[PDB]
């Protein structure tokens, strides 16, 4: 009977919605419809024999109201910071995203970096080593993911949930 509120953040087009759609619905769609408003999906997993309800919030990387939507960080217990390995800009922007988390989220929020679209290695711009190094510099975890090929999607969410649970259980 745990309830963990998670938030996906990162530039438009990196695959936040698709990563969640794989996790929650076990499917992949190649269409790109930028996310409208803010909403969640629910999936309950089991850790250490306990039921962990994950309420995972998704909103657009839309720039227009980005200064206002920093409001959303406050309620997050864990945050996935997503970039696209085929898009250097999305990775360059992770620094700015992490500063927003530090400014607006709880100091103890759990954070993970996802380098998504790792199935499109033929268009890779960001080396895995650079993603690993960025994560190293902030002391947080890193995975390359693919919503399409179903690479590390379960792993990412279970790992983030396990880290939230471990901190919580130390009370």
Ligand X SMILES: Nc1nc2c(ncn2[C@@H]2O[C@H](COP(=O)(O)OP(=O)(O)NP(=O)(O)O)[C@@H](O)[C@H]2O)c(=O)[nH]1
Taken as a whole, the chain contains a residue count of 171
Select from ligand X, Mg ion, none the partner in contact with residue 111, using the beta carbon and a kind-dependent cut-off of 5 to 8 Å. Answer: none
SS3 assignment, position 150: coil
Residue 14 near ligand X by CB under 6 A? yes
Whole-angstrom distance, CA of residue 102 vs CA of residue 46: 29
Q: Which stretch binds ligand X (CB under 6 A): 12-20, 69-77, 92-100, 160-168?
A: 12-20
Q: Return the residues of window 29-58 that contact ligand X according to CB under 6 A.
A: 29-32, 34-35
Under DSSP, the state recorded for 15 is: S
Which residues, in sequence order, are bridge partners of residue 52? 2, 45
Whole-angstrom distance, CA of residue 167 vs CA of residue 115: 25
Number of residues that bind ligand X (CB under 6 A): 22
SS3 assignment, position 157: helix
Residue 119 near ligand X by CB under 6 A? yes
Residue 90 near Mg ion by CB under 5 A? no
Residues annotated within a binding site for Mg(2+): 17, 35, 58
- Per CB under 5 A, residues contacting Mg ion are 16-17, 35
């Amino acid at each position: 009977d745990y309830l963990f509120k998670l938030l996906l953040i990162g530039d438009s087009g990196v695959g936040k919605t698709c990563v969640l759609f794989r996790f929650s619905e076990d499917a992949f769609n190649s269409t790109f419809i930028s996310t409208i408003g803010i909403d969640f999906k629910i999936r309950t997993i089991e850790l250490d024999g306990k039921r962990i309800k994950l309420q995972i919030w998704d909103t657009a990387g839309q720039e227009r109201f980005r200064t206002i939507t920093t409001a959303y960080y406050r309620g997050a217990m864990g945050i996935m910071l997503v970039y696209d390995i085929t898009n250097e800009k999305s990775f360059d922007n992770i620094r700015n995203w992490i500063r927003n988390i530090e400014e607006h989220a709880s100091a103890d929020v759990e954070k993970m970096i996802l380098g998504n679209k790792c199935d499109v290695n033929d268009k890779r711009q960001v080396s895995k080593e650079r993603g690993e190094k960025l994560a190293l510099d902030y002391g947080i975890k890193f995975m390359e993911t693919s919503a399409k090929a179903n690479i590390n999607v379960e792993n990412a969410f279970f790992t983030l949930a396990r880290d939230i649970k471990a901190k919580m259980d130390k009370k």
